[PDB]
Amino acid sequence: QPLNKYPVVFVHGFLGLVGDNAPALYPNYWGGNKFKVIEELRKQGYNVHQASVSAFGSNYDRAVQLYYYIKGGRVDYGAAHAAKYGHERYGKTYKGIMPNWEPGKKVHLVGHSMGGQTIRLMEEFLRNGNKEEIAYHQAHGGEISPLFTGGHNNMVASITTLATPHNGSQAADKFGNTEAVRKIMFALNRFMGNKYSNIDLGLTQWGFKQLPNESYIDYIKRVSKSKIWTSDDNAAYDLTLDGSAKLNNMTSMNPNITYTTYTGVSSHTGPLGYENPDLGTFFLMDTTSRIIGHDAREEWRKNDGVVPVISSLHPSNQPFVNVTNNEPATRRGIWQVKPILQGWDHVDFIGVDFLDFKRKGSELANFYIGIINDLLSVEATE
Amino acid sequence: QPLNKYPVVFVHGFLGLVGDNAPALYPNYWGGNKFKVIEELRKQGYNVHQASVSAFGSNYDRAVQLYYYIKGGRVDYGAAHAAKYGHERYGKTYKGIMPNWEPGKKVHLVGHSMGGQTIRLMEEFLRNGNKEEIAYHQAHGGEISPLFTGGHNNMVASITTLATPHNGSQAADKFGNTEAVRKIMFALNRFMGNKYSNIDLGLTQWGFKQLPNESYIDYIKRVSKSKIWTSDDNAAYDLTLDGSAKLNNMTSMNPNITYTTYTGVSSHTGPLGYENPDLGTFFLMDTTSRIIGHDAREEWRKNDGVVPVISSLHPSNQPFVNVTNNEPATRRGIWQVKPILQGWDHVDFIGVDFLDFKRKGSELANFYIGIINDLLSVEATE
Numbered sequence: 001q002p003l004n005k006y007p008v009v010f011v012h013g014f015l016g017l018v019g020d021n022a023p024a025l026y027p028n029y030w031g032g033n034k035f036k037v038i039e040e041l042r043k044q045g046y047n048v049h050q051a052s053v054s055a056f057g058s059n060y061d062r063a064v065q066l067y068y069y070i071k072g073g074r075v076d077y078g079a080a081h082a083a084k085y086g087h088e089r090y091g092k093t094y095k096g097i098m099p100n101w102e103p104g105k106k107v108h109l110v111g112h113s114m115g116g117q118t119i120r121l122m123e124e125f126l127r128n129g130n131k132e133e134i135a136y137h138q139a140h141g142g143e144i145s146p147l148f149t150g151g152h153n154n155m156v157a158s159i160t161t162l163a164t165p166h167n168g169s170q171a172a173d174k175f176g177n178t179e180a181v182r183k184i185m186f187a188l189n190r191f192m193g194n195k196y197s198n199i200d201l202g203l204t205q206w207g208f209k210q211l212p213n214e215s216y217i218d219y220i221k222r223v224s225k226s227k228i229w230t231s232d233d234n235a236a237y238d239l240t241l242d243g244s245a246k247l248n249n250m251t252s253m254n255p256n257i258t259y260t261t262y263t264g265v266s267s268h269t270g271p272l273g274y275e276n277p278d279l280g281t282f283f284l285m286d287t288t289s290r291i292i293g294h295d296a297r298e299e300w301r302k303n304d305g306v307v308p309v310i311s312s313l314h315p316s317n318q319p320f321v322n323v324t325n326n327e328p329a330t331r332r333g334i335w336q337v338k339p340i341l342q343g344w345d346h347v348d349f350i351g352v353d354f355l356d357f358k359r360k361g362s363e364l365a366n367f368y369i370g371i372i373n374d375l376l377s378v379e380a381t382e
Numbered sequence: 383q384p385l386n387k388y389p390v391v392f393v394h395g396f397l398g399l400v401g402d403n404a405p406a407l408y409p410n411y412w413g414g415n416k417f418k419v420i421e422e423l424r425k426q427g428y429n430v431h432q433a434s435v436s437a438f439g440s441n442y443d444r445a446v447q448l449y450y451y452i453k454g455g456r457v458d459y460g461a462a463h464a465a466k467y468g469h470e471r472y473g474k475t476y477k478g479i480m481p482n483w484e485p486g487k488k489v490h491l492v493g494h495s496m497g498g499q500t501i502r503l504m505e506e507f508l509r510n511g512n513k514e515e516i517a518y519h520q521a522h523g524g525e526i527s528p529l530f531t532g533g534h535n536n537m538v539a540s541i542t543t544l545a546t547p548h549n550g551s552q553a554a555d556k557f558g559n560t561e562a563v564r565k566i567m568f569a570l571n572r573f574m575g576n577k578y579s580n581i582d583l584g585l586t587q588w589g590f591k592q593l594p595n596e597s598y599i600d601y602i603k604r605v606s607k608s609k610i611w612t613s614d615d616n617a618a619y620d621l622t623l624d625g626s627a628k629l630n631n632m633t634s635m636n637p638n639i640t641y642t643t644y645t646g647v648s649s650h651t652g653p654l655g656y657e658n659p660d661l662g663t664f665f666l667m668d669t670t671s672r673i674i675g676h677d678a679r680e681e682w683r684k685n686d687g688v689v690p691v692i693s694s695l696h697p698s699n700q701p702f703v704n705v706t707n708n709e710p711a712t713r714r715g716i717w718q719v720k721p722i723l724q725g726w727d728h729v730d731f732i733g734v735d736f737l738d739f740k741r742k743g744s745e746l747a748n749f750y751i752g753i754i755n756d757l758l759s760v761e762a763t764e
């Protein structure tokens with residue numbers, strides 16, 4: 001039936017709210033009003049889906065969630081993890097987009113920003129399990145999620161990342177992951193946990209869901225005991241240079257996966273060799289783009305508004321090859337780095353910068369069809 | 383005390399809310415965060431004030447309000463006017479910025495956008511009165527506002543307009559003044575008339591103030607009988623080409639007043655000769671700028687986002703002279719048209735386009751100091 005034999009799953013980044021989980025008025029993550037990625041690709045007979053995972057969660061939490069989004073079932077963050085960081089072991093339960101998913105039946109994964117990292121970690125679990133959970137179920141018995149076992153191979157065909165901060169971002173180091181702003185993010189999570197809320201910002205495993213019979217004051221009190229406030233098991237940390245490195249150190253190349261990356265630049269070189277945001281950089285990334293572009297290390301300055309170019313091209317100590325826009329991106333085992341997209345900012349990739357006339361919908365539709373083509377190629381070269 | 387012998391009054395345009403009449407979070411009309419016009423000019427020892435008049439009212443209503451803003455007293459729209467259009471004769475009562483205002487004590491008037499038109503009409507009344515009101519107080523006796531008398535001369539030194547649609551705007555013709563959107567504007571006015579509201583959008587004379595003991599349902603009912611819904615005595619109409627023409631036809635040059643205009647361009651010529659908004663044009667003017675720039679008459683296309691250049695330069699049927707930036711603008715009796723400011727949009731003039739880094743505060747401060755200088759010149763060349 002569908003033109004693509006393996007389904008394509010699009011994995012949003014940090015703060016990503018998609019589908020039924022967005023506010024009443026809110027931009028549409030995958031494509032904005034420029035190109036309705038899911039709807040349009042479907043009209044053209046491609047099987048495509050958009051995952052919904054934790055907007056504020058760590059990559060670990062998101063990676064677990066992603067698995068359950070595809071496979072269906074009750075999120076199991078694993079007993080050891082839960083115990084280490086101090087959050088619920090079990091989480092939401094998902095219908096499952098592909099309940100038969102197992103070695104043999106494959107999926108294409110494309111991830112925007114932090115979605116890139118999430119995809120990589122999930123494949124890690126599939127192939128090589130989770131050591132701490134294997135170890136814990138060794139010592140203490142019990143049931144273990146298959147996700148954490150290892151040996152599940154031949155389940156992901158491609159990993160493709162749009163503006164992913166593979167090597168982290170100064171924006172996280174010097175802003176996002178600071179004390180003051182973590183407290184804000186957590187407060188937002190606390191609030192949207194109120195008994196009148198219909199959105200899930202993704203930190204409920206930490207106890208940010210008010211019980212229907214509990215006062216807001218008791219809620220505040222209950223939840224201020226949560227480890228979330230001082231924990232590292234959260235998105236803000238995973239986006240730092242340290243945080244991202246950790247994930248790099250614990251991942252490896254799957255030689256049957258077709259790995260490909262895209263990158264944007266949206267800064268320009270200023271008086272002293274520092275980088276400043278172009279007019280056209282979506283305005284909410286103004287300050288981050290300046291923090292990044294004023295980095296002491298010079299090669300860390302060119303940025304797309306929140307991710308510097310070094311960070312996006314490839315995870316820094318993994319194999320990569322520079323690639324052409326015309327040549328087929330068909331090499332397994334190595335990070336095929338597509339040429340930098342001049343004047344695309346972080347959010348241009350998902351078409352939500354309605355302020356930027358220079359980034360037209362027909363352009364964005366080419367880009368996504370581009371990606372589907374590459375994917376079709378991967379399918380045809382097995 | 384003050385470096386300027388005659389006070390400078392800045393008159394905001396359509397939708398203009400200033401001072402104590404703005405919402406909790408709301409941009410500051412005169413200068414935004416770029417250059418606090420009123421506060422800064424004062425720090426440098428200039429006597430300057432910001433008028434507060436009807437945001438949605440006709441030029442007539444605003445002109446009357448302006449007079450009372452300066453002079454102090456209870457707004458009197460005049461009995462014949464009130465009767466003709468079908469709205470309260472009396473309105474808010476103003477403390478008075480300048481209680482002694484009379485021939486001999488003069489004021490400098492600078493108006494942004496529709497503020498330009500309002501200033502023109504008020505001076506007309508001062509000099510040549512209102513015929514309808516003269517006539518009606520003839521037939522039916524009573525008291526008459528001094529504004530409508532005529533013969534009050536030598537009271538305004540200068541009229542200076544920033545991006546005023548002297549000849550109206552297609553944006554009004556094809557959008558602002560349509561049936562559907564007038565109804566929206568009026569609903570907003572109706573709502574902000576509620577008994578919990580602290581802002582005055584300027585249409586209360588039409589009955590849009592809920593009485594403290596009246597239900598919202600009775601309010602809706604009472605007010606749906608108001609002439610406002612189908613009247614022309616409103617801003618949206620006065621901003622149309624017809625509407626603006628009417629004011630042109632009934633105004634004339636006072637040869638002791640120093641008339642000066644500024645204009646912005648913020649569109650660029652496309653493939654087929656039509657004009658499109660530059661990146662940098664404040665985003666709320668996107669659609670208007672396209673409507674204007676796609677006009678059949680070609681000379682009506684270059685625009686600042688909502689006002690086409692033909693409209694801003696000078697009222698089309700009145701005397702004007704092109705001027706240089708250095709040429710001191712000191713000619714009485716004729717519209718001294720300053721050279722177009724390239725890449726200034728409608729709102730750049732008042733510094734509220736926080737999205738536009740290209741428009742710096744130091745630039746805006748020069749422009750305003752510019753204006754004060756010209757005014758000082760007018761003072762010194764009497």
Ligand SMILES: OC1(c2ccc(Cl)c(C(F)(F)F)c2)CCN(CCCC(c2ccc(F)cc2)c2ccc(F)cc2)CC1
Nearest residue numbers: 014015017027028029169171172176239284288306346352
């Ligand atoms: O700040 C971002 C970030 C990314 C990575 C890192 Cl590492 C960091 C860090 F480190 F600094 F914290 C920060 C995340 C979100 N930012 C703006 C969000 C846009 C928003 C939007 C976009 C897509 C949607 F589906 C829904 C809403 C929106 C709002 C209003 C609107 F009119 C249009 C769009 C861009 C970058």
Ligand SMILES: OC1(c2ccc(Cl)c(C(F)(F)F)c2)CCN(CCCC(c2ccc(F)cc2)c2ccc(F)cc2)CC1
Nearest residue numbers: 396397398399408409410411551553554558621666688734
């Ligand atoms: O729409 C406008 C118009 C003008 C003339 C005509 Cl003729 C027509 C018509 F009729 F054709 F439709 C329409 C009026 C106001 N528009 C945008 C409002 C700006 C707003 C602002 C401005 C001044 C303030 F003191 C405070 C806020 C604001 C909002 C948010 C923000 F982040 C910054 C500024 C621009 C043009």
Ligand SMILES: CCCCCCCCCCC(=O)O
Nearest residue numbers: 576577578579596597598599
């Ligand atoms: C009859 C009064 C209800 C008007 C409709 C809603 C207005 C909002 C009231 C604001 C507030 O209570 O702070």
Ligand SMILES: CCCCCCCCCCC(=O)O
Nearest residue numbers: 354397665666667668669670
């Ligand atoms: C408050 C000034 C009038 C602007 C109306 C047009 C804007 C609607 C387009 C949607 C958007 O703002 O993204």
Ligand SMILES: CCCCCCCC(=O)O
Nearest residue numbers: 017022023024025026027
């Ligand atoms: C991110 C802001 C959410 C918008 C709230 C407006 C709701 C409404 O008026 O229906």
Ligand SMILES: CCCCCCCC(=O)O
Nearest residue numbers: 023024025026027028354
């Ligand atoms: C098109 C109507 C505009 C008001 C609501 C949209 C706000 C948003 O961009 O989320």
Ligand SMILES: CCCCCC(=O)O
Nearest residue numbers: 397399405570574581
């Ligand atoms: C940009 C429109 C301003 C209208 C003022 C208000 O809604 O209170």
Ligand SMILES: CCCCCC(=O)O
Nearest residue numbers: 025283284354665666
């Ligand atoms: C928070 C983003 C700016 C305002 C968006 C809009 O009015 O469409």
Ligand SMILES: [Ca+2]
Nearest residue numbers: 280282345356
């Ligand atoms: Ca952009």
Ligand SMILES: [Ca+2]
Nearest residue numbers: 662663727738
């Ligand atoms: Ca601008």
Ligand SMILES: [Cl-]
Nearest residue numbers: 023188192199
């Ligand atoms: Cl939210």
Ligand SMILES: [Cl-]
Nearest residue numbers: 101102146152
């Ligand atoms: Cl499995």
Ligand SMILES: [Cl-]
Nearest residue numbers: 193197199200
């Ligand atoms: Cl919830």
Ligand SMILES: [Cl-]
Nearest residue numbers: 575579581582
């Ligand atoms: Cl009121």
Ligand SMILES: [Zn+2]
Nearest residue numbers: 060061085233
């Ligand atoms: Zn966790």
Ligand SMILES: [Zn+2]
Nearest residue numbers: 442443467615
């Ligand atoms: Zn009136």
